[PDB]
Design a protein around this ligand. Structure first.
Ligand code: NDP
Ligand code: NDP
Ligand code: TNE
Ligand code: TNE
Lengths: 259, 259
């Protein structure tokens, strides 16, 4: 792998069947990496593979429900064999949202969002650890959110899971430093995805969304690839001194207050 | 309650038999509030109740294991009955620490700490919400940790629970603002509690603690009364405009880097 590329590096991207995860598979696939992604739908993944492999991308995928502990274990074994026990990149992107007020959450909502958004990321990280070390140049990137540092409507529990993940990111950077593993987080602002799409279907969430874009310096939504570009850089051998950092690609929304 | 006192206010402080929590009961009550506390050791509570009552503090205590959804409800009912359905202050202080590296955490472990550290506080706040509202001047104060924002050894997961709490603190201040409730967090540094006394029994950890103390401006351990002091003020009517804050009572710990 070169200073500004991932030629040869292997990688696992959770939830790459849509949006940002998809933007990330393509970004790394295009920079030389061999990718392996997953989602809860085979037919969807297959349509993704058809598109990816048509551009010369070295990609492979398989159905997996990250909300299930036992499955995540199976996923790690398969990917491991696939990459011959050597994984350079782990992009913990899969995440879901449940728009409700704090007090309106059912044990079902809370347990689901926490297993998928945090548990799963924490869990996979640990499962991938021995392979990242053996790679001798591992990188773990967590996809956070601006919502894990600042309050947003209906995202209290969702931010709670992203705020947990960021502390995890920070601590792991220090525990795995000796294992050659750099650990970083990337907090997206508002990026145009299927998740954001289903969202604006609601007249309230749409009004709430335009508030966000207005509070931006760029005042527009990001593109799955503007986000993916930051994730890719963090994986190059060029980002060698960068670890334990949480970086936001929000078009300036984190720096705002009265604009 | 005057601008600088708590006379007439009612409050619940989880985990008041020892440490910071014991310290908080004494401070709020000393300031005229009517407290109710809990812990998993009845005999200890009884020694405390005898201590506090001896000096005239108005306080009640029941046994409850916060790691249990049912027991928590049980507690909210009594408390509410005890205080006639009006709760002014809720202080989510209970917490445990399990010093293992993120990858060495077992499920029982992750479940235990996540359950006590973040779940119960979240759950207890919601359950309390109705009487906090009825009181007409509700205050919720989550006891976080410096480890909730920065890497500390063996506290990767613990820190994740505080990072989740911290985000929830911010959001709740906004969701419950119209209910006339203020929500903040108080992140301790190194306070001399029984948890610490226990922690430094291990040589390696004794070394780790000293690392921190040498890392704070005031180069010393704070006292429970010193953490209680910051919690009693956010509850004072004098602190009416403070909401959504995470304040650190750490002797300078959070401002250091090269000292
Ligand atoms: N788009 C935005 O504006 C922002 C997104 N984010 C974060 O970015 C990440 C991606 O979100 P985004 O692209 O918007 O969302 P999308 O819904 O567009 O994509 C999420 C992807 O994750 C996959 N996924 C979800 N749950 C599982 C599961 N249990 N098992 C396997 N795959 C799963 C989905 O596949 P499937 O549904 O088929 O299972 C899908 O491919 C998340 O962590 C989100 O919190 C944060 C801030 C902003
Ligand atoms: N001491 C320090 O330096 C720091 C402490 N903190 C935070 O301060 C808070 C208190 O810590 P500290 O005073 O040091 O700890 P202590 O161990 O001294 O006291 C903790 C108290 O919480 C109670 N408790 C724990 N679990 C439960 C439970 N499941 N149900 C009911 N009560 C419970 C304990 O009682 P029992 O065991 O008998 O049930 C005890 O009375 C925590 O949130 C901790 O994370 C954060 C940073 C620094
Ligand atoms: C609506 N909401 C906005 C943008 C996408 C979605 C998740 C988030 O973190 C903030
Ligand atoms: C050692 N470690 C320090 C101080 C007490 C213990 C827990 C914590 O949160 C930070």
């Amino acid at each position: 792998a070169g200073r500004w590329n991932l030629e040869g590096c292997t990688a696992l991207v959770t939830g790459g069947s849509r949006g940002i995860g998809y933007g990330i598979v393509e970004e790394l696939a295009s920079l030389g990496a061999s990718v392996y992604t997953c989602s809860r739908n085979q037919k969807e993944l297959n349509d993704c593979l058809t598109q990816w492999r048509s551009k010369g991308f070295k990609v492979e995928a398989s159905v997996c429900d990250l909300s299930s502990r036992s499955e995540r274990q199976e996923l790690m074994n398969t990917v491991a064999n696939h990459f011959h026990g050597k994984l350079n990149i782990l992009v913990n992107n899969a995440g879901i949202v449940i728009y409700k007020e704090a007090k309106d959450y059912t044990v079902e909502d809370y347990s689901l969002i926490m297993s998928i958004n945090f548990e799963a990321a924490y869990h996979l990280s640990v499962l991938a650890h021995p392979f990242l070390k053996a790679s001798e140049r591992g990188n773990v990137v967590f996809i956070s959110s601006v919502s894990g540092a600042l309050a947003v409507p209906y995202e209290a529990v969702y931010g709670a899971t992203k705020g947990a993940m960021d502390q995890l990111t920070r601590c792991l950077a220090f525990e795995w430093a000796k294992d050659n593993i750099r650990v970083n987080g990337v907090g997206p602002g508002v990026i145009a995805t299927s998740l954001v799409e289903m969202t604006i279907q609601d007249p309230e969430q749409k009004e709430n969304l335009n508030k966000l874009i207005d509070r931006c310096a760029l005042r527009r939504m990001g593109e799955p690839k503007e986000l993916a570009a930051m994730v890719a850089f963090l994986c190059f051998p060029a980002a060698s001194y960068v670890t334990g950092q949480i970086i936001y690609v929000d078009g300036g929304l984190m720096a705002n207050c009265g604009f």
